[PDB]
Each structure stands twice: as C-alpha cells, then as structure tokens.
Amino acid sequence: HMTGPMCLIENTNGRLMANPEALKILSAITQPMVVVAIVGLYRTGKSYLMNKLAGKKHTKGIWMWCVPHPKKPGHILVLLDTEGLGDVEKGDNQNDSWIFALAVLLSSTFVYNSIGTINQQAMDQLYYVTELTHRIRSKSDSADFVSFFPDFVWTLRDFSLDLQPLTPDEYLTYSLKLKKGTSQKDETFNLPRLCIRKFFPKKKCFVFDRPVHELDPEFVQQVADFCSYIFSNSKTKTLSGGIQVNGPRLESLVLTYVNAISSGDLPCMENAVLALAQIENSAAVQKAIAHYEQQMGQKVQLPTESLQELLDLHRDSEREAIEVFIRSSFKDVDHLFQKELAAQLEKKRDDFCKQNQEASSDRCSGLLQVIFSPLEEEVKAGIYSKPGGYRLFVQKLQDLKKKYYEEPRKGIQAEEILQTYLKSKESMTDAILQTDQTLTEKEKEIEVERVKAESAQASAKMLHEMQRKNEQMMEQKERSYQEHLKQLTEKMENDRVQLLKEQERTLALKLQEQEQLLKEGFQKESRIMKNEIQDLQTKM
C-alpha cells in the first residue's frame, strides 16, 4: 500500500495542482473512506499525531496518507495533512485560505492543532475560519455549512494550564463564548467564535503535555486517548443523500474543487455532487444494459413457443435491469439517464421480437420441406393421377398437416408459414380433384367449396392472431412504462425520507445553538439563527 504520505494538492508559487499520481491511487481505492484532516503550523508537531493515526512505528499543500482503517474493516482511513500553512508568510502564501477551505470540504473530521492555550494569538492564527463564507458555496448560504461540515477537533500541544473542575471540552466551550458590546474589536473577537460554533456539527478538545522532560507516560496516554477517539468516532465521509465517499468519488471532489478555484470560481458542494452524478449515472445505464443482455442471453432460445413467452422473459430482465440502474444512480436530474435506459431497453425488445419472427420462419420453412417434400415428389411422379387419386391425396395431406402441427416449438410463424404453403399448392390440388374420374360433378363442386371455406377460416384465424399480437405489444409497452415509474417513485420516496432525516439533524443542531445564544442573552445572533431555522423549516 502507501509507504508514506504523498502530495495530493500541491501549492507552489500561487497555483493549486492536483497530483495525478495521487489521484491514480485514489481511483483504485474502492472502499469507503473515513477522512481526517490534520491542520496547523509545522511547529505544532501535528506530524507526530499523523504518524500515530497512520499506525506508523518541502512541497506545500495537502498531503494524503491512505491506510486500512484499524477498527473499521472494509474501510480506508485517509489522513490529509496541511504542509506549509502559515509557514511561508514571506514567500508564496497566496493559497493558504484555499488550503484550509479544501481541508474542510474533503474531510469527515477536522483536527486543528496549536500550541499552549486558546488566547488572542491562537484565534488570530485561526483567521481562516472567518473566510469560509467567502470561499465555500453550498448551493448551485453559510447557513447550510453545518449539514455537511466535518466534526471539529482542537488539539492543544504543550498545554500550560492545569484544568469536573474543568475538562478540555469545557475549556473549549468557555473559550468560544462571545463578548457583549458592538465595538469593532469585539466583533473581531466574536467572528471566529461564531464561525466555529455555527459551522461545525460537533466540537471536541484534547490537551497534551510535553513529550519529554522514552517519552513521559502522560503524553503517550493522551496521544493514545486521541487516536482511540478518532478510530472510534470519526465517520465515513458522506455527501448529500448519504452517498459514501470512496477513492474515485474523492478523486472527483478534488478535481472539481481544484478546477473551480483554478477557474476563478468558488468550490461548490452541490456542483461536486452533480458532477459525480454525471459519471456514475452514465455508468449505471451501462451496468443495467449489461445485466439485461446477460439475462436475455441465458434465458432466451429463439424461436420461443409464443410471443407471450418472449415478452415475459423481456419483462423480468427489464425489471432487473431497472433495479440495477436505480441502485447505482443518484441525482438523475430531469430523469435523462433513465429515459435513455428506457429507450435502449425498448429497442432491445423490438430487436428480439424481429429475431424471434425470423427464427420461427426458418424453423417452420425447414420442417415444411422435410415433411412435405416426399408428397411433392409423389405428385410429380403422377402417383395421384389415377381413379380415386384425390381422396388418397387429401388423406395424405391431412396426415402431414397433423405431423407439422405436432412438431415442437415452431414459434409464432407456424400458421402463416403453413397456410402460405398450402395456398401455393391449391391449384395443384384442384387439378388432382378435377382429374379424378371417380367423383361426380356435384361432389367436386362440394369439395371445391369446402376447401374454399377451410381457407377463409384460416385467413380468419391469422387475422385475429395478428390483432392479438398487436394488443400484447401495446400491453407490454404500457407495463414497461409503468415499471420505470414504479421503481423511480420508490427511489424518490427513499430519497425524500433520507433528506428529511438530514434536515431534522440540522434543525436539532441549530436549535441547540440558537437557544444557547438566547440564554446567553445574545438576542441579535439568536434571532439570526432563528431566521436560519425558519428558512430550513419552510423547505422541510
């Protein structure tokens, strides 16, 4: 696997470049990923935390380190590390805010590292958080941030304070309290705190003692308690609709967000999802058609006994093909991909019906030759050109028709093939009749009429069967149309339920924060969040 971290998004002299070698690696990782970003200056020694998380034991931008997840089988742990952030203020530091924002968009958990305590200097260095509303777009809207942002973790290295009397989380909570008053310096003080409190769904704080002065036990145990928390609490990275992010999906997100920035636009979460949808829905149609071809290829043997047998085989294969498509697609705006699939499946049906007709014709035409050729040679030899020859011919003929009808699985063309054959021999048959000197004129007159009636009956049947087939085709067409709608409607219902669950989650989180601000007496901010809550509830 990966021997060590690799640069994923390079940041050099003002341009952001997705490393093709890193993407290639991502494109091959099919398993779902838990993505943890480790952010901060080099001096923070966050590099140690990264090695511990990777289970282990310069070019700027975002480095990645993919390893199997230690506690989640079938999942990959993706560590994202910021290199050079705030470390080149006298050099090429023009992309620092973009790097911070990208770490937020790509992760499940966002670990921010700093040294000492949370003081004025600590907050100023975290100014990037106040630029998120200007560097990230939710809809194709910072109020939606909490619905997709990673959980926030603040690690304090070499914690100098001595804190229950005061736990780390309580320390962080107090550190995030706002200042009353409307002075400029106050708004400056409150901005980053408001951003942290309103943008991230969960917050967690960890403090660490100095490593040395082996390493001091307390430190080793704090790092262990940290890694354990991440291994057990960090969630699989997901996008709207509960889409779980794996390698190809992460690759897509990186390209979309980086291309957006390099194009002078803002990285947009909804756009990233729509881009992924174009790729995966196209693939879903292919997978569905492939499944259809496979099933029909193993279950269909032309000619079929009847048309209904063919239509029923197509009906089952089509139902399964649609299930495959529905399961593998998402955000099929205007249902364009499904409409394409429907068109392709209808063409498949028509082709199979044409082939079925051709196969039946071949089979019957062959049996016709095998069964009736002898009689044809007897007639030519003049075996029936004798007294009473007509009645021996008619009986022989009837016996052969019976044999023909007894042949198995002749297909839908059985009747048409035989009648067309008999029609062509009608003249030859009449000759034998009119030539048989043992029959009275009246008897011949009767025979001619019988054959005439028998023929009209036949044409009658074929006409009916032709109308019947047209009805069966129009029927199956309606069934297919209704089957596509049935499965789509079910999927949309499941999507509706999933979205509601997501919105209820967001609502509960916003209510908790909103009420806190209220109790803390921050009327203005509380009302602002009340407005955010109202917009959400209307949409719900």
Side-chain angles (χ1 to χ4, degrees), residues 83-121:
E83 286 290 333
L85 196 67
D87 280 336
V88 294
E89 292 296 76
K90 301 183 72 63
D92 53 328
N93 77 327
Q94 57 268 52
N95 290 327
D96 288 14
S97 290
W98 277 136
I99 293 300
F100 187 96
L102 284 162
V104 170
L105 285 170
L106 299 170
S107 66
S108 303
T109 296
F110 193 91
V111 185
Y112 184 71
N113 304 260
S114 72
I115 302 168
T117 67
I118 294 179
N119 54 11
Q120 179 60 59
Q121 179 188 359

Side-chain angles (χ1 to χ4, degrees), residues 97-98 100-102 104-105 126-139 141-146 148-149 190-200 265-269 510 525 528 532:
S97 290
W98 277 136
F100 187 96
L102 284 162
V104 170
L105 285 170
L126 187 50
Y127 76 88
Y128 315 103
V129 81
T130 68
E131 296 182 21
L132 293 176
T133 59
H134 303 288
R135 297 179 175 285
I136 293 171
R137 191 104 304 164
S138 305
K139 304 170 183 176
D141 48 39
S142 74
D144 302 329
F145 286 359
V146 74
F148 64 88
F149 268 31
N190 305 308
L191 190 54
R193 295 179 168 70
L194 273 169
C195 289
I196 295 174
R197 294 174 58 168
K198 299 174 68 180
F199 298 166
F200 303 83
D265 302 298
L266 303 182
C268 175
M269 186 283 277
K510 286 192 180 297
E525 290 308 323
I528 290 181
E532 279 169 34

Side-chain angles (χ1 to χ4, degrees), residues 29 50 52 83 85 186 198 206 223 250 261 282 326 330 339 365 400 427 450 461 479 494:
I29 302 172
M50 174 171 241
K52 284 296 185 181
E83 286 290 333
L85 196 67
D186 279 45
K198 299 174 68 180
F206 289 95
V223 177
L250 182 61
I261 296 170
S282 189
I326 298 293
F330 58 87
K339 292 176 180 177
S365 289
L400 299 182
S427 184
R450 184 189 69 72
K461 278 195 171 185
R479 284 179 185 283
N494 288 338

Side-chain angles (χ1 to χ4, degrees), residues 31 265 446 516:
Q31 302 109 301
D265 302 298
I446 301 304
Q516 273 295 158

